[PDB]
Amino acid sequence: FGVKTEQEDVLAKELEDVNKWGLHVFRIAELSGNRPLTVIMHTIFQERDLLKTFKIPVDTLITYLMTLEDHYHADVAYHNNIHAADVVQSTHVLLSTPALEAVFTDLEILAAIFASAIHDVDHPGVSNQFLINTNSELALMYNDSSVLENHHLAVGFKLLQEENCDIFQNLTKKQRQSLRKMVIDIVLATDMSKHMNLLADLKTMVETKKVTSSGVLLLDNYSDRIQVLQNMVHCADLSNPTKPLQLYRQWTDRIMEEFFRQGDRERERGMEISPMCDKHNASVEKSQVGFIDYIVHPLWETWADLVHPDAQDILDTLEDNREWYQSTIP
Numbered sequence: 068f069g070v071k072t073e074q075e076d077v078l079a080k081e082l083e084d085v086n087k088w089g090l091h092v093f094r095i096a097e098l099s100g101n102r103p104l105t106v107i108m109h110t111i112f113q114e115r116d117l118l119k120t121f122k123i124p125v126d127t128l129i130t131y132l133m134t135l136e137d138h139y140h141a142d143v144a145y146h147n148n149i150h151a152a153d154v155v156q157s158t159h160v161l162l163s164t165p166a167l168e169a170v171f172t173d174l175e176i177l178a179a180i181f182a183s184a185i186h187d188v189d190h191p192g193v194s195n196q197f198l199i200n201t202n203s204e205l206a207l208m209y210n211d212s213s214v215l216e217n218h219h220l221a222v223g224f225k226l227l228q229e230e231n232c233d234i235f236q237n238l239t240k241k242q243r244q245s246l247r248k249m250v251i252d253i254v255l256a257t258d259m260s261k262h263m264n265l266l267a268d269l270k271t272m273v274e275t276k277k278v279t280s281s282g283v284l285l286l287d288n289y290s291d292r293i294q295v296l297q298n299m300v301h302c303a304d305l306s307n308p309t310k311p312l313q314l315y316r317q318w319t320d321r322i323m324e325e326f327f328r329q330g331d332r333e334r335e336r337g338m339e340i341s342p343m344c345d346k347h348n349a350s351v352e353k354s355q356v357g358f359i360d361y362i363v364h365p366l367w368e369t370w371a372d373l374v375h376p377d378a379q380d381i382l383d384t385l386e387d388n389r390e391w392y393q394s395t396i397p
Protein backbone atom coordinates (compact mmCIF):
# COMPACT_ATOMS: atom_id res chain seq x y z
CA PHE A 68 0.00 0.00 0.00
CA GLY A 69 2.61 2.58 -1.37
CA VAL A 70 5.96 0.93 -0.51
CA LYS A 71 7.71 -2.34 -1.24
CA THR A 72 6.63 -5.79 0.07
CA GLU A 73 9.47 -7.35 2.19
CA GLN A 74 10.38 -9.75 -0.65
CA GLU A 75 10.64 -6.69 -2.90
CA ASP A 76 13.15 -4.99 -0.42
CA VAL A 77 15.56 -7.96 -0.37
CA LEU A 78 15.33 -8.00 -4.17
CA ALA A 79 16.00 -4.25 -4.35
CA LYS A 80 19.15 -4.76 -2.25
CA GLU A 81 20.50 -7.54 -4.45
CA LEU A 82 19.82 -5.25 -7.46
CA GLU A 83 22.29 -2.74 -6.01
CA ASP A 84 24.97 -5.11 -7.36
CA VAL A 85 23.66 -4.62 -10.95
CA ASN A 86 26.85 -2.75 -12.02
CA LYS A 87 29.16 -5.48 -10.66
CA TRP A 88 30.63 -8.52 -12.33
CA GLY A 89 29.36 -11.33 -10.09
CA LEU A 90 25.76 -10.27 -9.43
CA HIS A 91 23.88 -13.18 -7.67
CA VAL A 92 21.64 -13.65 -10.63
CA PHE A 93 20.24 -16.98 -9.33
CA ARG A 94 19.20 -15.31 -6.07
CA ILE A 95 17.54 -12.54 -8.11
CA ALA A 96 15.68 -15.19 -10.04
CA GLU A 97 14.40 -16.74 -6.80
CA LEU A 98 13.46 -13.40 -5.23
CA SER A 99 11.70 -12.01 -8.33
CA GLY A 100 9.35 -15.08 -8.66
CA ASN A 101 11.37 -16.19 -11.72
CA ARG A 102 11.48 -12.73 -13.23
CA PRO A 103 15.15 -12.04 -13.39
CA LEU A 104 15.15 -10.81 -16.98
CA THR A 105 12.30 -8.35 -16.36
CA VAL A 106 13.72 -6.89 -13.14
CA ILE A 107 17.30 -6.69 -14.31
CA MET A 108 16.30 -5.08 -17.66
CA HIS A 109 14.01 -2.62 -15.91
CA THR A 110 16.74 -1.63 -13.45
CA ILE A 111 19.24 -1.21 -16.27
CA PHE A 112 16.77 0.88 -18.35
CA GLN A 113 16.14 3.19 -15.29
CA GLU A 114 19.89 3.38 -14.45
CA ARG A 115 20.79 4.35 -18.01
CA ASP A 116 17.79 6.66 -18.47
CA LEU A 117 16.62 4.79 -21.54
CA LEU A 118 12.91 5.26 -20.86
CA LYS A 119 13.30 9.07 -21.02
CA THR A 120 15.73 9.10 -23.89
CA PHE A 121 13.53 6.86 -26.12
CA LYS A 122 10.14 7.83 -24.68
CA ILE A 123 9.37 4.32 -23.64
CA PRO A 124 6.18 4.19 -21.59
CA VAL A 125 6.97 2.24 -18.45
CA ASP A 126 3.86 0.01 -18.69
CA THR A 127 4.79 -0.92 -22.26
CA LEU A 128 8.35 -1.77 -21.17
CA ILE A 129 7.14 -4.01 -18.39
CA THR A 130 4.56 -5.73 -20.58
CA TYR A 131 7.15 -6.36 -23.30
CA LEU A 132 9.70 -7.64 -20.79
CA MET A 133 7.29 -10.03 -19.17
CA THR A 134 6.20 -11.29 -22.56
CA LEU A 135 9.80 -11.72 -23.63
CA GLU A 136 10.68 -13.50 -20.45
CA ASP A 137 7.66 -15.83 -20.86
CA HIS A 138 9.00 -17.02 -24.22
CA TYR A 139 12.16 -18.34 -22.61
CA HIS A 140 11.51 -21.97 -21.67
CA ALA A 141 11.46 -22.66 -17.95
CA ASP A 142 12.11 -26.40 -18.54
CA VAL A 143 15.44 -25.75 -20.33
CA ALA A 144 18.31 -25.88 -17.92
CA TYR A 145 20.81 -23.46 -19.38
CA HIS A 146 19.21 -21.44 -22.26
CA ASN A 147 16.44 -19.87 -20.20
CA ASN A 148 15.51 -16.41 -18.82
CA ILE A 149 18.21 -16.59 -16.17
CA HIS A 150 20.88 -16.92 -18.82
CA ALA A 151 19.24 -14.04 -20.76
CA ALA A 152 19.27 -11.92 -17.61
CA ASP A 153 22.87 -12.82 -16.99
CA VAL A 154 23.97 -11.88 -20.50
CA VAL A 155 22.08 -8.58 -20.34
CA GLN A 156 23.73 -7.70 -17.03
CA SER A 157 27.20 -8.74 -18.17
CA THR A 158 26.76 -6.67 -21.32
CA HIS A 159 25.71 -3.75 -19.17
CA VAL A 160 28.86 -4.03 -17.07
CA LEU A 161 31.07 -4.37 -20.20
CA LEU A 162 29.46 -1.21 -21.67
CA SER A 163 30.52 0.71 -18.55
CA THR A 164 34.20 -0.20 -19.04
CA PRO A 165 36.44 2.92 -18.70
CA ALA A 166 38.10 2.35 -22.06
CA LEU A 167 34.70 2.71 -23.78
CA GLU A 168 33.50 5.77 -21.83
CA ALA A 169 31.49 8.08 -24.11
CA VAL A 170 32.29 5.96 -27.19
CA PHE A 171 28.78 4.55 -27.95
CA THR A 172 25.55 6.45 -28.58
CA ASP A 173 22.38 5.84 -26.66
CA LEU A 174 20.92 4.00 -29.67
CA GLU A 175 23.97 1.68 -29.73
CA ILE A 176 23.68 1.06 -26.01
CA LEU A 177 19.98 0.25 -26.48
CA ALA A 178 20.83 -2.13 -29.33
CA ALA A 179 23.43 -4.01 -27.33
CA ILE A 180 21.21 -4.38 -24.31
CA PHE A 181 18.06 -5.33 -26.28
CA ALA A 182 20.11 -7.78 -28.36
CA SER A 183 21.37 -9.40 -25.15
CA ALA A 184 17.84 -9.71 -23.84
CA ILE A 185 16.36 -11.40 -26.87
CA HIS A 186 19.44 -13.32 -28.00
CA ASP A 187 18.29 -16.83 -26.91
CA VAL A 188 14.49 -16.33 -26.70
CA ASP A 189 12.42 -19.46 -27.37
CA HIS A 190 15.53 -21.71 -27.29
CA PRO A 191 14.39 -25.40 -27.28
CA GLY A 192 17.56 -26.63 -25.46
CA VAL A 193 19.16 -28.38 -28.44
CA SER A 194 21.79 -27.26 -30.92
CA ASN A 195 21.48 -26.06 -34.50
CA GLN A 196 22.96 -29.34 -35.76
CA PHE A 197 20.34 -31.31 -33.81
CA LEU A 198 17.59 -29.20 -35.39
CA ILE A 199 19.08 -29.70 -38.84
CA ASN A 200 19.60 -33.52 -38.46
CA THR A 201 15.98 -34.03 -37.22
CA ASN A 202 14.46 -32.10 -40.06
CA SER A 203 12.83 -29.64 -37.69
CA GLU A 204 10.54 -26.97 -38.95
CA LEU A 205 12.94 -24.20 -37.81
CA ALA A 206 15.80 -25.70 -39.80
CA LEU A 207 13.47 -25.74 -42.82
CA MET A 208 12.41 -22.19 -42.22
CA TYR A 209 15.95 -20.82 -42.06
CA ASN A 210 17.63 -23.11 -44.62
CA ASP A 211 19.91 -24.67 -41.99
CA SER A 212 21.77 -21.37 -41.51
CA SER A 213 22.12 -19.91 -37.93
CA VAL A 214 18.76 -21.57 -37.30
CA LEU A 215 18.39 -20.78 -33.65
CA GLU A 216 19.82 -17.29 -33.94
CA ASN A 217 17.50 -16.29 -36.76
CA HIS A 218 14.64 -17.64 -34.70
CA HIS A 219 15.66 -15.69 -31.59
CA LEU A 220 15.63 -12.46 -33.61
CA ALA A 221 12.32 -13.19 -35.28
CA VAL A 222 10.61 -13.92 -31.96
CA GLY A 223 12.25 -11.01 -30.19
CA PHE A 224 10.95 -8.60 -32.82
CA LYS A 225 7.57 -10.25 -33.34
CA LEU A 226 6.76 -9.94 -29.67
CA LEU A 227 6.80 -6.11 -30.12
CA GLN A 228 3.43 -6.52 -31.84
CA GLU A 229 1.64 -8.04 -28.86
CA GLU A 230 -0.79 -5.84 -26.90
CA ASN A 231 1.05 -2.86 -25.42
CA CYS A 232 4.45 -4.38 -26.19
CA ASP A 233 5.93 -1.91 -28.71
CA ILE A 234 8.71 -0.42 -26.70
CA PHE A 235 10.06 1.38 -29.83
CA GLN A 236 6.74 3.04 -30.73
CA ASN A 237 8.25 6.56 -30.32
CA LEU A 238 11.52 6.05 -32.16
CA THR A 239 11.70 7.59 -35.58
CA LYS A 240 11.90 5.38 -38.61
CA LYS A 241 15.68 6.18 -38.98
CA GLN A 242 16.28 5.19 -35.38
CA ARG A 243 14.26 2.00 -35.77
CA GLN A 244 16.08 0.93 -38.92
CA SER A 245 19.44 1.55 -37.34
CA LEU A 246 18.51 -0.18 -34.11
CA ARG A 247 17.11 -3.16 -36.03
CA LYS A 248 20.17 -3.57 -38.17
CA MET A 249 22.52 -3.40 -35.13
CA VAL A 250 20.42 -5.94 -33.16
CA ILE A 251 20.37 -8.34 -36.05
CA ASP A 252 24.20 -8.04 -36.52
CA ILE A 253 24.73 -8.59 -32.80
CA VAL A 254 22.43 -11.65 -32.35
CA LEU A 255 23.72 -13.37 -35.52
CA ALA A 256 27.22 -13.06 -34.10
CA THR A 257 26.24 -15.22 -31.11
CA ASP A 258 26.30 -18.31 -33.32
CA MET A 259 29.49 -20.14 -32.28
CA SER A 260 30.16 -21.00 -35.93
CA LYS A 261 31.07 -17.32 -36.24
CA HIS A 262 33.45 -17.28 -33.25
CA MET A 263 36.81 -17.68 -35.10
CA ASN A 264 36.03 -14.87 -37.58
CA LEU A 265 34.84 -12.53 -34.86
CA LEU A 266 37.99 -13.22 -32.86
CA ALA A 267 40.29 -12.74 -35.90
CA ASP A 268 38.64 -9.37 -36.46
CA LEU A 269 38.88 -8.48 -32.78
CA LYS A 270 42.66 -9.34 -32.89
CA THR A 271 43.10 -7.23 -36.02
CA MET A 272 41.47 -4.34 -34.21
CA VAL A 273 43.78 -4.73 -31.20
CA GLU A 274 46.84 -4.77 -33.55
CA THR A 275 45.66 -1.48 -35.22
CA LYS A 276 44.16 -0.01 -31.98
CA LYS A 277 43.75 3.80 -31.91
CA VAL A 278 42.78 5.97 -28.99
CA THR A 279 41.47 9.51 -28.61
CA SER A 280 43.36 12.20 -26.67
CA SER A 281 41.21 11.35 -23.59
CA GLY A 282 42.46 7.65 -23.65
CA VAL A 283 39.24 6.15 -25.00
CA LEU A 284 38.90 3.76 -27.95
CA LEU A 285 38.54 5.35 -31.38
CA LEU A 286 35.87 3.72 -33.57
CA ASP A 287 35.15 5.99 -36.57
CA ASN A 288 33.15 3.64 -38.89
CA TYR A 289 30.10 1.30 -38.54
CA SER A 290 32.10 -1.82 -39.27
CA ASP A 291 34.43 -1.26 -36.27
CA ARG A 292 31.71 -0.05 -33.95
CA ILE A 293 29.49 -3.03 -34.66
CA GLN A 294 32.45 -5.46 -34.42
CA VAL A 295 33.11 -4.21 -30.88
CA LEU A 296 29.43 -4.54 -29.91
CA GLN A 297 29.29 -7.98 -31.45
CA ASN A 298 32.37 -9.08 -29.52
CA MET A 299 31.07 -7.47 -26.38
CA VAL A 300 27.82 -9.45 -26.37
CA HIS A 301 29.71 -12.52 -27.49
CA CYS A 302 32.02 -12.05 -24.42
CA ALA A 303 28.93 -11.76 -22.23
CA ASP A 304 27.52 -14.96 -23.75
CA LEU A 305 30.90 -16.65 -22.99
CA SER A 306 31.32 -15.03 -19.57
CA ASN A 307 30.42 -17.94 -17.26
CA PRO A 308 33.99 -19.06 -16.60
CA THR A 309 35.02 -15.50 -15.74
CA LYS A 310 32.57 -15.24 -12.87
CA PRO A 311 33.01 -16.14 -9.20
CA LEU A 312 33.28 -19.90 -9.00
CA GLN A 313 29.92 -20.45 -7.16
CA LEU A 314 28.21 -18.91 -10.23
CA TYR A 315 30.39 -20.62 -12.82
CA ARG A 316 29.74 -24.03 -11.32
CA GLN A 317 25.98 -23.55 -11.49
CA TRP A 318 26.29 -22.56 -15.16
CA THR A 319 28.48 -25.60 -15.77
CA ASP A 320 25.91 -27.93 -14.09
CA ARG A 321 23.23 -26.30 -16.21
CA ILE A 322 24.95 -26.46 -19.59
CA MET A 323 25.91 -30.11 -18.98
CA GLU A 324 22.37 -31.02 -17.99
CA GLU A 325 21.23 -29.45 -21.24
CA PHE A 326 23.91 -31.21 -23.32
CA PHE A 327 23.24 -34.59 -21.67
CA ARG A 328 19.49 -34.22 -22.29
CA GLN A 329 20.31 -33.61 -25.96
CA GLY A 330 22.55 -36.69 -25.97
CA ASP A 331 19.73 -38.79 -24.46
CA ARG A 332 17.43 -37.53 -27.19
CA GLU A 333 20.05 -38.47 -29.80
CA ARG A 334 20.69 -41.96 -28.30
CA GLU A 335 16.89 -42.74 -28.09
CA ARG A 336 16.67 -41.94 -31.83
CA GLY A 337 19.80 -43.87 -32.85
CA MET A 338 21.57 -40.63 -33.96
CA GLU A 339 25.28 -40.14 -33.49
CA ILE A 340 25.75 -38.57 -30.04
CA SER A 341 27.04 -34.99 -30.34
CA PRO A 342 30.44 -33.98 -28.84
CA MET A 343 30.16 -33.86 -24.95
CA CYS A 344 26.50 -34.88 -24.84
CA ASP A 345 27.19 -38.47 -23.71
CA LYS A 346 26.57 -38.73 -19.95
CA HIS A 347 28.08 -42.28 -19.95
CA ASN A 348 31.33 -41.12 -21.64
CA ALA A 349 32.00 -37.51 -20.48
CA SER A 350 34.63 -35.52 -18.61
CA VAL A 351 32.86 -32.38 -17.37
CA GLU A 352 36.06 -31.02 -15.83
CA LYS A 353 38.32 -31.71 -18.80
CA SER A 354 35.74 -30.19 -21.15
CA GLN A 355 35.69 -26.97 -19.10
CA VAL A 356 39.47 -26.79 -19.31
CA GLY A 357 39.20 -27.26 -23.05
CA PHE A 358 36.45 -24.65 -23.31
CA ILE A 359 38.60 -22.17 -21.44
CA ASP A 360 41.89 -22.94 -23.24
CA TYR A 361 40.57 -22.99 -26.82
CA ILE A 362 37.50 -20.61 -26.75
CA VAL A 363 36.99 -18.46 -23.66
CA HIS A 364 40.57 -17.49 -22.72
CA PRO A 365 41.59 -16.53 -26.27
CA LEU A 366 38.54 -14.27 -26.62
CA TRP A 367 38.84 -12.69 -23.19
CA GLU A 368 42.58 -12.17 -23.49
CA THR A 369 41.96 -10.35 -26.74
CA TRP A 370 39.12 -8.32 -25.18
CA ALA A 371 41.42 -7.52 -22.22
CA ASP A 372 44.07 -6.13 -24.63
CA LEU A 373 41.41 -4.00 -26.31
CA VAL A 374 40.30 -2.41 -23.03
CA HIS A 375 43.65 -2.71 -21.15
CA PRO A 376 43.80 -2.72 -18.16
CA ASP A 377 40.01 -2.68 -17.38
CA ALA A 378 39.48 -6.47 -17.68
CA GLN A 379 42.50 -7.64 -15.64
CA ASP A 380 40.43 -8.96 -12.69
CA ILE A 381 38.04 -10.74 -15.05
CA LEU A 382 41.01 -12.44 -16.77
CA ASP A 383 42.55 -13.30 -13.32
CA THR A 384 39.30 -14.92 -12.23
CA LEU A 385 39.13 -16.90 -15.45
CA GLU A 386 42.72 -18.22 -14.95
CA ASP A 387 41.94 -19.10 -11.30
CA ASN A 388 38.79 -20.97 -12.30
CA ARG A 389 40.72 -22.78 -14.96
CA GLU A 390 43.26 -24.07 -12.38
CA TRP A 391 40.41 -25.08 -10.19
CA TYR A 392 38.77 -27.25 -12.89
CA GLN A 393 42.25 -28.64 -13.92
CA SER A 394 42.86 -29.70 -10.32
CA THR A 395 39.58 -31.73 -10.29
CA ILE A 396 40.30 -33.89 -13.32
CA PRO A 397 40.70 -37.53 -11.97
Ligand SMILES: COc1ccc(C2=NN(C3CCCCCC3)C(=O)[C@@H]3CC=CC[C@H]23)cc1OCCCCOc1ccc(-c2nnn[nH]2)cc1
Pocket residue numbers: 257259304305307308318319322323342343354355357358359361362
Ligand atom coordinates in the same frame (compact mmCIF):
# COMPACT_ATOMS: atom_id res chain seq x y z
C1 LIG B 1 29.77 -23.01 -18.78
O1 LIG B 1 30.03 -23.98 -19.78
C2 LIG B 1 29.60 -23.74 -21.04
C3 LIG B 1 28.69 -22.77 -21.40
C4 LIG B 1 28.32 -22.62 -22.72
C5 LIG B 1 28.85 -23.43 -23.70
C6 LIG B 1 28.46 -23.27 -25.12
N1 LIG B 1 28.96 -24.13 -25.92
N2 LIG B 1 28.69 -23.96 -27.24
C7 LIG B 1 29.71 -24.50 -28.15
C8 LIG B 1 29.52 -25.96 -28.45
C9 LIG B 1 30.27 -26.91 -27.52
C10 LIG B 1 31.66 -27.23 -27.98
C11 LIG B 1 32.64 -26.10 -27.85
C12 LIG B 1 32.21 -24.82 -28.52
C13 LIG B 1 31.10 -24.09 -27.76
C14 LIG B 1 27.61 -23.36 -27.73
O2 LIG B 1 27.39 -23.35 -28.91
C15 LIG B 1 26.72 -22.67 -26.74
C16 LIG B 1 25.85 -21.60 -27.39
C17 LIG B 1 26.54 -20.29 -27.50
C18 LIG B 1 27.63 -19.98 -26.84
C19 LIG B 1 28.36 -20.97 -26.01
C20 LIG B 1 27.53 -22.15 -25.54
C21 LIG B 1 29.77 -24.41 -23.35
C22 LIG B 1 30.14 -24.57 -22.04
O3 LIG B 1 31.05 -25.52 -21.66
C23 LIG B 1 30.63 -26.88 -21.70
C24 LIG B 1 31.30 -27.53 -22.88
C25 LIG B 1 32.69 -27.02 -23.20
C26 LIG B 1 33.41 -27.73 -24.32
O4 LIG B 1 34.16 -26.74 -25.02
C27 LIG B 1 35.31 -27.10 -25.69
C28 LIG B 1 35.67 -26.30 -26.76
C29 LIG B 1 36.81 -26.59 -27.48
C30 LIG B 1 37.60 -27.67 -27.14
C31 LIG B 1 38.81 -27.96 -27.91
N3 LIG B 1 39.69 -28.91 -27.66
N4 LIG B 1 40.64 -28.81 -28.62
N5 LIG B 1 40.37 -27.84 -29.41
N6 LIG B 1 39.22 -27.30 -28.99
C32 LIG B 1 37.24 -28.45 -26.06
C33 LIG B 1 36.10 -28.17 -25.33
Ligand SMILES: [Mg+2]
Pocket residue numbers: 186187215257258
Ligand atom coordinates in the same frame (compact mmCIF):
# COMPACT_ATOMS: atom_id res chain seq x y z
MG1 LIG C 1 22.45 -18.59 -28.54
Ligand SMILES: [Zn+2]
Pocket residue numbers: 150154186187257304
Ligand atom coordinates in the same frame (compact mmCIF):
# COMPACT_ATOMS: atom_id res chain seq x y z
ZN1 LIG D 1 23.36 -17.33 -25.04
